[PDB]
Amino acid sequence: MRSVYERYLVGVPGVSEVWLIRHADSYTGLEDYDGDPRDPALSEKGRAQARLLAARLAGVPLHGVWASGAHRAQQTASAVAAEHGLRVRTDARLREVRTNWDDGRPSELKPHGVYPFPEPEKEVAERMRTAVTAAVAATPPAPDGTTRVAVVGHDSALVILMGSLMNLGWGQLDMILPLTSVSVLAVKDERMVVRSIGDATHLAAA
Amino acid sequence: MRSVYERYLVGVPGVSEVWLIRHADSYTGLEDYDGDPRDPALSEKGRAQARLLAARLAGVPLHGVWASGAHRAQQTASAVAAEHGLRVRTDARLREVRTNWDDGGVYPFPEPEKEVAERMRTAVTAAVAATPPAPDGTTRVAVVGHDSALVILMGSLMNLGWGQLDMILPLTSVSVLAVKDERMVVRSIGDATHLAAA
Ligand code: NA
């Protein structure tokens, strides 16, 4: 009967938490899209979100911080890591789904919910899952209590990961992850379970 | 994108926030509750969770606090409400789904799923309508309820059936809705990160 909470990773020894974080606001500070548009820094707004996120996470025990190689993810992760004495570790498997088609067009957003991206959903989920597993594997276990790892990534890849863990097809999990939102996973080896999704309540304060 | 944000009410102006909260731990002290097991107070562990939740929400503008008539919901709501000088308001429509059969995935309850969703959605709408708008900013109402009825509401708002939203809401978790009269959108689900705070 409690094989149902073995699959829920509840009351199970050696469960780690992964706090999936969408990066903060970018496209560069809005004097104009002044810098290199291919890898923009956080905007002035995004820098403020990243501060509120880093303050909220300052109060939590944290044992590793990972990000994609995108500047906007790195800069969000760096604010978080600095509150804890951690390095940011980088993994290309956390990059956003490929959105541009090779023939010249961008990815549409059909209402139906047929998956619209040129990189297949199962590929995105597999690299995201592998990254999450590898990050936990790379983190020494917390001295007391739950090993916790922050992972800073990108909206569509994060939702694709969470939907795959929840057995929900593209667009069934009909929500948009806020910038600097926190979604918590529970991880025990290759078992991985969604605990919470999309919380950006630290943006309510300021 | 313009149409997107209108679907999700993100960037739409007159949207209110409803922070749906599962009540804190109860059935209270020991194997043997010394109290009335039909309507238990929070446990020692539940009072601690409620303190953490109250400290988390102390820094958020809040304009109203509602709960079911269950003691464990009321006591959780009271701890939140006390940080803002608010009165706890009570609505029976926020009660847990009926769990017991009159005689004694597949939806397991005698109270059908759609009725639970309807009374929960109506309660949320009525609470927002009962809250004077914020002086400046988003009007925000905390609503303390029960795990199954909360998940049924969120699933119904996302056109998911029972079991598709395959999550259990932690005790004292916060799930945020965006509300505009009859439009109502799930923005976050199940966050109990204040219980990690050392
Ligand atoms: Na940088």
SS (H, E, C) chain B: CHHHHHHCCCCCCCCEEEEEEECCCCCCCCCCCCCCCCCCCCCHHHHHHHHHHHHHHHCCCCCEEEECCCHHHHHHHHHHHHCCCCCEEECHHHCCCCCCCCCCCCCCCCCCHHHHHHHHHHHHHHHHHCCCCCCCCCCEEEEEECHHHHHHHHHHHCCCCCCCCCCCCCCCCEEEEEEECCEEEECCECECHHHCCC
Read off the CATH number of the domain in which B22 is found. 3.40.50.1240
∠ CA B120-B123-B125, nearest 5°, is 110
Q: Is residue B56 part of a domain?
A: yes
Q: Which residue has the tokens 């790195």?
A: A74
Q: Which residues surround ligand 1, an ion (CB under 5 A)?
A: A 75
User: Which amino acid is residue A91, in one-letter code?
Assistant: D
Residue A14 exposure: Cα atoms within 13 Å on the Cβ side: 8
Rounded CA separation A189/A136 (Å): 8
∠ CA A5-A11-A15, nearest 5°, is 100
Q: Which residue has the tokens 């409400």?
A: B81
Instruction: Give A30 to chain B, closest Cα distance, Å.
Output: 18
Q: Is residue A5 part of a domain?
A: no
Q: Is residue B7 part of a domain?
A: no
Rounded CA separation A85/A66 (Å): 14
A vs B, Cβ pairs < 8 A, gives: 87
User: Which amino acid is residue B70, in one-letter code?
Assistant: A
Q: Is residue A31 part of a domain?
A: yes
Instruction: Give B72 to chain A, closest Cα distance, Å.
Output: 22
Rounded CA separation B158/A25 (Å): 26
Greatest Cα pair distance, chain B, in angstroms, is 57
Q: How far is CA A88 from CA A71, A91, B91, in A?
A: 12, 10, 47
Please give the tally of structural domains in chain A: 1
Nearest to A125 by CA among A81, A76, A160, A83: A160
Tokens of residue A161, six digits? 């990961």
- Which domain does A128 fall in, by range? 13-205
Query: How close is the Cα of A132 to the center of ligand 1, in Å?
Result: 23
Determination technique used: X-ray
B67: which strand partners?
Answer: B90, B144
User: Which amino acid is residue A19, in one-letter code?
Assistant: W
Are A118 and A100 contacting, i.e. CB atoms less than 8 angstroms apart? yes
∠ CA B2-A74-A24, nearest 5°, is 30
CA dihedral A204, B43, B153, B139 (to 10 degrees): -30
Rounded CA separation A16/A34 (Å): 41
Q: Is residue B66 part of a domain?
A: yes
Q: Which residues of B46-79 are buried (b: 16+ CB within 10 A; e: fewer)?
A: bbebbebbbebbeebbbbbbbbbebbbbbbbbbb
Binding site: which residues of A? 108, 110, 155
* Long-range pairs for A66-69: beta carbons < 8 A, 24 or more residues apart: A66/A90, A66/A91, A66/A94, A66/A131, A66/A135, A66/A149, A66/A150, A66/A151, A66/A152, A67/A23, A67/A91, A67/A94, A67/A151, A67/A152, A67/A153, A68/A92, A68/A94, A68/A95, A68/A96, A68/A152, A68/A153, A68/A154, A69/A95
Q: Are strands B64-67 and B88-90 parallel, antiparallel or unpaired?
A: parallel
- The backbone torsions φ and ψ at residue B174, rounded to the nearest 5 degrees and listed phi first, read -110, 125
The reply to whether A178 touches chain B by the CB within 8 Å rule is yes
**What is the stated resolution of the deposited model, in angstroms?**
1.7
Nearest to A159 by CA among A130, A132, A121, A103: A121
Q: Which of residues 111-170 of B touch A (CB under 8 A)?
A: 138, 140, 158-160, 164-168, 170
The reply to whether B43 touches chain A by the CB within 8 Å rule is no
Q: Is residue B27 part of a domain?
A: yes
Q: Is residue B187 part of a domain?
A: yes
What is the SS3 assignment for chain A?
CHHHCCCCCCCCCCCEEEEEEECCCCCCCECECCCCCCCCCCCHHHHHHHHHHHHHHCCCCCCEEEECCCHHHHHHHHHHHCCCCCCEEECHHHCCCCCCCCCCCCCCCCCCCCCCCCCCHHHHHHHHHHHHHHHHHCCCCCCCCCCEEEEEECHHHHHHHHHHHHCCCCCCCCCCCCCCCEEEEEEECCEEEECCECECCHHHHC
Nearest to B153 by CA among B176, B180, B129: B176
Are B17 and B139 contacting, i.e. CB atoms less than 8 angstroms apart? yes
Greatest Cα pair distance, chain A, in angstroms, is 59
Q: B167 Cβ partners below 8 Å, 6+ apart? A: A166, A194, A195, A196, B151, B189, B190
**B173/A196 CB distance under 8 A:** yes
Nearest to A174 by CA among B149, B173, B157, B117: B157
